Amino acid sequence: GDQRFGDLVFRQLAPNVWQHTSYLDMPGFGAVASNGLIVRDGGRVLVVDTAWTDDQTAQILNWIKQEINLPVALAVVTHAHQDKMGGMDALHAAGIATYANALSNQLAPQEGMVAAQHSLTFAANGWVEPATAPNFGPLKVFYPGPGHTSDNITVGIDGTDIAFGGCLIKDSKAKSLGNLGDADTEHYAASARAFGAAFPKASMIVMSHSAPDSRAAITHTARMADKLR
Numbered sequence: 174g175d176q177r178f179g180d181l182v183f184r185q186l187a188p189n190v191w192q193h194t195s196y197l198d199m200p201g202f203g204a205v206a207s208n209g210l211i212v213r214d215g216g217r218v219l220v221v222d223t224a225w226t227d228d229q230t231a232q233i234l235n236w237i238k239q240e241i242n243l244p245v246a247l248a249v250v251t252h253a254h255q256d257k258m259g260g261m262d263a264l265h266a267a268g269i270a271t272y273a274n275a276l277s278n279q280l281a282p283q284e285g286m287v288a289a290q291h292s293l294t295f296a297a298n299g300w301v302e303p304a305t306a307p308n309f310g311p312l313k314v315f316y317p318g319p320g321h322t323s324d325n326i327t328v329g330i331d332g333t334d335i336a337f338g339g340c341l342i343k344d345s346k347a348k349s350l351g352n353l354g355d356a357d358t359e360h361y362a363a364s365a366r367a368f369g370a371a372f373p374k375a376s377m378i379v380m381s382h383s384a385p386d387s388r389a390a391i392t393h394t395a396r397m398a399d400k401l402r
């Protein structure tokens with residue numbers, strides 16, 4: 174199931190979808206895994222989230238070249254923290270068009286991140302304004318409200334049972350909501366439930382720091398966030 178490729182791990186989730194996993198030593202927390210996605214859409218590849226670092230992200234591109242061998246048309250990154258945007262320079266060095274929530278791009282410099290080239294904006298109901306996400310193919314981008322961060326976004330993969338919650342969603346056995354340093358504790362619970370409601374048929378919930386889980390990940394994350402109120 175898991176394919177080790179250098180210091181990264183890749184796991185196929187569906188015929189056209191793989192999870193990428195990279196690791197960073199956090200003093201006091203061990204070597205922390207972070208997950209993103211790789212999607213083949215016909216003759217091109219779409220990426221959700223970088224790895225923690227430029228070098229790791231270049232290795233994702235190397236894995237794509239060896240295992241898929243199609244151009245990477247774009248990447249979308251799901252908030253302005255290192256696990257999701259730390260490898261932006263590697264995407265730009267490779268010539269890949271990059272997208273993030275406008276707010277993520279605004280926050281990127283102060284977070285020590287490099288902004289994506291393009292900014293996504295969202296309707297009042299949370300769905301991305303399609304003009305800002307051209308050529309996204311099966312990627313359906315949804316802003317659920319502030320939670321893990323104020324800028325966190327989520328992605329469903331049309332034609333699959335997969336939805337990606339990023340750092341907003343924790344697994345059904347998680348003991349905490351993780352890093353709340355930039356979290357909106359008041360709105361977290363509602364944002365988690367809004368993610369589930371935006372992707373009601375998604376049976377495989379992919380997230381940043383745990384293996385894919387059932388929809389119980391959503392209901393359990395929302396119960397834990399209730400305590401922050």
Ligand SMILES: Cc1cc2oc(=O)cc(CP(=O)(O)O)c2cc1C
Pocket residue numbers: 199202205254255256257340351352354
């Ligand atoms: C323990 C911990 C602390 C953190 O402090 C930060 O400032 C940013 C992150 C990355 P995050 O997972 O929040 O996107 C972070 C991650 C972990 C595990």
Ligand SMILES: [Zn+2]
Pocket residue numbers: 252254321322340
């Ligand atoms: Zn984060």
Ligand SMILES: [Zn+2]
Pocket residue numbers: 256340351381382
């Ligand atoms: Zn995280």
